[PDB]
Amino acid sequence: RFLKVKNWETDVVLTDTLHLKSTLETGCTEHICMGSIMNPVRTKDQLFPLAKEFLDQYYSSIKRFGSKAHMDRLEEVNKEIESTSTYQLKDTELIYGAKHAWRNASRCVGRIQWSKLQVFDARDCTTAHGMFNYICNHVKYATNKGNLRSAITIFPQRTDGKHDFRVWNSQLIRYAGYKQPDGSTLGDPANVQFTEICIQQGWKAPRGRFDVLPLLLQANGNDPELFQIPPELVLEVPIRHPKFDWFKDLGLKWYGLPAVSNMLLEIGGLEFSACPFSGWYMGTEIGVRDYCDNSRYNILEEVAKKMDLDMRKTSSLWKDQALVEINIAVLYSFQSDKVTIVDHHSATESFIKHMENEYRCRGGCPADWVWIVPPMSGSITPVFHQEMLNYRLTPSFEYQPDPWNTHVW
Amino acid sequence: RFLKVKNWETDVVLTDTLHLKSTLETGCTEHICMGSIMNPVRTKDQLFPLAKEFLDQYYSSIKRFGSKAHMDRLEEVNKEIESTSTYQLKDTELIYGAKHAWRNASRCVGRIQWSKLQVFDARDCTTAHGMFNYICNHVKYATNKGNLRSAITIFPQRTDGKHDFRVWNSQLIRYAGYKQPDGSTLGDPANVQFTEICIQQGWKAPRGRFDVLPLLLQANGNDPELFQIPPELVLEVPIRHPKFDWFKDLGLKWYGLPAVSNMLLEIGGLEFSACPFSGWYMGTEIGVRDYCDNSRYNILEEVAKKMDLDMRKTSSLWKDQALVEINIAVLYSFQSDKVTIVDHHSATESFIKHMENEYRCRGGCPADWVWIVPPMSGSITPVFHQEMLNYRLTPSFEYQPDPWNTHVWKG
Numbered sequence: 001r002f003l004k005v006k007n008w009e010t011d012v013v014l015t016d017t018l019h020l021k022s023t024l025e026t027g028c029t030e031h032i033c034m035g036s037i038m039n040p041v042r043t044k045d046q047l048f049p050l051a052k053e054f055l056d057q058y059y060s061s062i063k064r065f066g067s068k069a070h071m072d073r074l075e076e077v078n079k080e081i082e083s084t085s086t087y088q089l090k091d092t093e094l095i096y097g098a099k100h101a102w103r104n105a106s107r108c109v110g111r112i113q114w115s116k117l118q119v120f121d122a123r124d125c126t127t128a129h130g131m132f133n134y135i136c137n138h139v140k141y142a143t144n145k146g147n148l149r150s151a152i153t154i155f156p157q158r159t160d161g162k163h164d165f166r167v168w169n170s171q172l173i174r175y176a177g178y179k180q181p182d183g184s185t186l187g188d189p190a191n192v193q194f195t196e197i198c199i200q201q202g203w204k205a206p207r208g209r210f211d212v213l214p215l216l217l218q219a220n221g222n223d224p225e226l227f228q229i230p231p232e233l234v235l236e237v238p239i240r241h242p243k244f245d246w247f248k249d250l251g252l253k254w255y256g257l258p259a260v261s262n263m264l265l266e267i268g269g270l271e272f273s274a275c276p277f278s279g280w281y282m283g284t285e286i287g288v289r290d291y292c293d294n295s296r297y298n299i300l301e302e303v304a305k306k307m308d309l310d311m312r313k314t315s316s317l318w319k320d321q322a323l324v325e326i327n328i329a330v331l332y333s334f335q336s337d338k339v340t341i342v343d344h345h346s347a348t349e350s351f352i353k354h355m356e357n358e359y360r361c362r363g364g365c366p367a368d369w370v371w372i373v374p375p376m377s378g379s380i381t382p383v384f385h386q387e388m389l390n391y392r393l394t395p396s397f398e399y400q401p402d403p404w405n406t407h408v409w
Numbered sequence: 410r411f412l413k414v415k416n417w418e419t420d421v422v423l424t425d426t427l428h429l430k431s432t433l434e435t436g437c438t439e440h441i442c443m444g445s446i447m448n449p450v451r452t453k454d455q456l457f458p459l460a461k462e463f464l465d466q467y468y469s470s471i472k473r474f475g476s477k478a479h480m481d482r483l484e485e486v487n488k489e490i491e492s493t494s495t496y497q498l499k500d501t502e503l504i505y506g507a508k509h510a511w512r513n514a515s516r517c518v519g520r521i522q523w524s525k526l527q528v529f530d531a532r533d534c535t536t537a538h539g540m541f542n543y544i545c546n547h548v549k550y551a552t553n554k555g556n557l558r559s560a561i562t563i564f565p566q567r568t569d570g571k572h573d574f575r576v577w578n579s580q581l582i583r584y585a586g587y588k589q590p591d592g593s594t595l596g597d598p599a600n601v602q603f604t605e606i607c608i609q610q611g612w613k614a615p616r617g618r619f620d621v622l623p624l625l626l627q628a629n630g631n632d633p634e635l636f637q638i639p640p641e642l643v644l645e646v647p648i649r650h651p652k653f654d655w656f657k658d659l660g661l662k663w664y665g666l667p668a669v670s671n672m673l674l675e676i677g678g679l680e681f682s683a684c685p686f687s688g689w690y691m692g693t694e695i696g697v698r699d700y701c702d703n704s705r706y707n708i709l710e711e712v713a714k715k716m717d718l719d720m721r722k723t724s725s726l727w728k729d730q731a732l733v734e735i736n737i738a739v740l741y742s743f744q745s746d747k748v749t750i751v752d753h754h755s756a757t758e759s760f761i762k763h764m765e766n767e768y769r770c771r772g773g774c775p776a777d778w779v780w781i782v783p784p785m786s787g788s789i790t791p792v793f794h795q796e797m798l799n800y801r802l803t804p805s806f807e808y809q810p811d812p813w814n815t816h817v818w819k820g
């Protein structure tokens with residue numbers, strides 16, 4: 001019922017009570033654990049409950065739980081649901097809902113910043129051009145000349161599943177992927193399929209290695225449209241090393257604004273299918289994963305060669321030596337160009353602090369160890385030795401089907 | 410019910426059917442996952458089934474399921490159970506049980522070697538002195554002058570829970586740790602408490618930074634006794650770096666035989682409380698955890714100083730650069746002395762093949778991602794990108810409370 005988590009390095013012991021309020025499922029059972037599995041239209045009777053659940057916590061957060069205002073709202077929404085078969089959140093409810101969806105994101109190590117989220121209410125949007133205007137404004141505001149500020153833009157909620165707003169890109173900004181005749185892959189293998197759909201829709205693919213993909217926007221269920229993000233808005237960073245000057249020769253560059261855009265935001269039962277959000281990078285995301293994953297830009301060997309490391313045997317740890325240098329470079333290049341970025345040590349230390357804060361001020365913090373521990377130097381970051389309890393609270397960010405496997409043209 | 414796991418790096422999908430034969434719990438519910446949590450006497454009544462399930466799996470494996478020998482053995486066991494409230498395994502079943510406990514250890518990345526396990530039957534042992542002799546033979550056989558061989562020694566099973574055999578050591582070979590009055594710690598911080606017990610039991614600690622702990626053995630529920638492992642049997646490796654001539658001056662060295670000795674081996678419902686086992690090290694266990702955890706030897710700083718890295722700001726990744734060098738040194742020192750050891754790239758690569766093989770020939774491979782992925786360079790090793798299913802099958806290795814917390818002293 002009441003659980004405890006121990007940090008095996010500091011012997012600290014936090015007591016979790018927040019999970020008692022858990023709602024969704026975890027994908028696990030007493031028989032089997034799926035902790036390492038990537039991913040283990042509502043009716044009126046379904047919505048009333050969710051809505052009630054949300055308002056209670058909302059009014060409870062503003063210290064007016066069971067007030068008249070509280071009861072009034074709950075009554076108004078219930079009426080609206082019976083009549084319209086859905087409802088609209090007050091601006092204050094939206095902001096609270098969004099900030100809390102981020103607060104509950106058990107896979108985000110950067111949640112200590114949760115309360116500072118800038119919310120852009122784009123619920124009055126009606127067309128894809130409108131979406132393009134809203135997104136550009138978001139990118140600009142968040143980039144802030146390098147002094148990144150977290151943000152989220154919320155388009156209209158779902159109604160009947162046939163008038164959904166969606167951003168087909170998985171991130172507002174990403175590099176294109178083209179399968180070459182060589183059999184190899186040019187650019188970013190992760191977006192090969194998305195790139196094909198752009199071309200298949202008209203994009204004039206430049207066929208380069210780091211071509212900023214075009215936004216593909218779907219408004220009110222209509223077919224998606226293309227737009228090219230004002231280049232002057234896409235801040236980028238050329239990657240160099242603070243010692244190896246041959247580094248710049250790999251011709252590597254990465255964008256400064258990470259902005260996940262394919263997720264679904266759920267607040268009080270309502271579903272916001274187009275809700276791009278952004279913060280700033282933790283070095284390892286680019287350095288370790290985007291650059292070295294075998295299925296991404298896989299630049300380990302090349303960097304290994306340039307370093308003249310004995311790549312004859314795995315035990316020389318040449319892959320490890322190289323991995324470290326690529327990550328020093330990334331962090332280096334960003335800090336030099338003066339763009340916000342955080343290293344895995346600093347970030348994890350912050351998350352540990354945030355966890356303790358959460359356990360005392362809220363009674364817990366759902367965390368997914370598998371995703372919290374960085375992809376490099378795991379055990380030398382504090383979160384590795386930190387036991388975690390993973391559970392699903394709402395408001396939340398959910399995964400959702402890539403629209404192309406769903407859109408009825 | 411069939412379950413599927415994908416590898417996000419090779420898109421290869423596998424199907425798990427083996428989880429259907431899972432029995433024990435996982436600590437998890439549909440409302441909460443505890444996959445990152447360290448750790449979430451039997452009666453005739455409950456023993457009959459456990460014995461039957463075991464004999465069935467055993468007889469199926471030798472391809473004699475349903476045979477007369479299978480049926481007689483099953484009748485033999487039951488008569489014995491209700492006759493004596495327990496039963497004795499045959500040598501072959503014991504060997505099979507041990508090998509499968511290893512095969513089912515979801516936290517072990519070295520399982521590709523499960524079938525080559527050397528099983529030593531010490532079920533005829535009656536005293537602590539007897540246990541010590543058995544333990545010396547295991548260390549000697551397993552070490553094999555540097556060419557390590559996996560092995561396990563199995564002492565008498567639990568009967569009434571008052572006559573238990575236990576190896577109070579957590580590993581047969583491990584360095585002492587001593588709390589200094591100024592708060593610091595000399596030696597290995599992980600063994601401070603056990604070291605204190607050994608001293609209290611009469612051990613004359615030389616108080617150095619790498620003193621091999623004495624064995625503290627409990628036979629048939631009696632009070633534990635001390636034994637010094639013959640020094641000529643404890644193989645050690647001086648730690649030096651292939652290019653940093655100053656590394657050797659750090660005074661570091663490590664033992665070559667990793668032999669966990671505090672677990673419990675469950676086979677056919679029977680409980681073996683003393684079952685030390687050993688294989689060989691994966692570099693990271695020593696170079697990442699034993700040397701760099703802040704709660705172990707914590708040498709990152711010193712190594713860092715000598716290399717003169719920018720230790721002013723973590724964003725220089727100085728910790729990360731030192732970690733790599735230390736692990737390179739560990740792998741290099743063992744290889745030079747010709748002491749079996751395996752780097753994490755090779756072990757995880759090997760474990761991924763074993764796992765695929767296991768799905769194909771067994772219908773699954775229970776695995777704990779949290780423990781399989783190495784403590785450094787996680788995503789550049791194949792297991793990181795591999796979805797896994799964690800569930801517990803028997804035979805199995807279980808945690809058991811430290812004996813000093815439960816032993817009823819005799820004086």
Ligand code: HEM
Pocket residue numbers: 101102105107108109110111113117150151152260277278279280281282285342347371397
């Ligand atoms: C400002 C600093 C931020 C940092 C350092 C941070 C860091 C991260 C990291 C390292 C992960 C895993 C990333 C991956 O491996 O793909 C993550 C996941 C996530 N973050 Fe954040 N984040 C930031 C801002 C945000 C914001 C503004 C939100 C939401 C409004 C958010 C919501 C989430 C969610 C839902 C996930 C999981 C996404 C998935 O499943 O792929 N993060 N974040």
Ligand code: HEM
Pocket residue numbers: 510511514516517518519520522526559560561686687688689690691694751756780806
């Ligand atoms: C062949 C050499 C071996 C290698 C390279 C290997 C590797 C490993 C590693 C790296 C771990 C995690 C270690 C830790 O963090 O403490 C592990 C866990 C484990 N191994 Fe092995 N192993 C070997 C042999 C064995 C043998 C012979 C057995 C069984 C008889 C075995 C049973 C286990 C079990 C039960 C665990 C989990 C222990 C726990 O929960 O603390 N391993 N092994």
Ligand SMILES: C[C@H](O)[C@@H](O)c1cnc2nc(N)nc(N)c2n1
Pocket residue numbers: 036037038370371372417793794795796797
């Ligand atoms: C989901 C799979 O186990 C594996 O692909 C995996 C594990 N942990 C992860 N953690 C983080 N932070 N990101 C990704 N992409 C991860 N991917």
Ligand SMILES: C[C@H](O)[C@@H](O)c1cnc2nc(N)nc(N)c2n1
Pocket residue numbers: 008384385386387445446447779780781
């Ligand atoms: C049990 C805690 O989550 C943490 O201390 C933790 C995580 N992963 C591990 N993995 C391995 N291989 N060994 C140990 N000791 C580990 N310890």
Ligand SMILES: NC(=[NH2+])NCCC[C@H](N)C(=O)O
Pocket residue numbers: 258259260278279280281282285286289290
């Ligand atoms: N720090 C963040 N907000 N990250 C969002 C996901 C970005 C993704 N992991 C990448 O490397 O591009």
Ligand SMILES: NC(=[NH2+])NCCC[C@H](N)C(=O)O
Pocket residue numbers: 519580667668669687688689690691694695698699
């Ligand atoms: N590879 C093995 N069999 N390891 C057994 C556990 C050893 C433990 N990780 C140590 O560093 O001492």
Ligand SMILES: [Zn+2]
Pocket residue numbers: 028029032033034035437441442443444
């Ligand atoms: Zn679980």
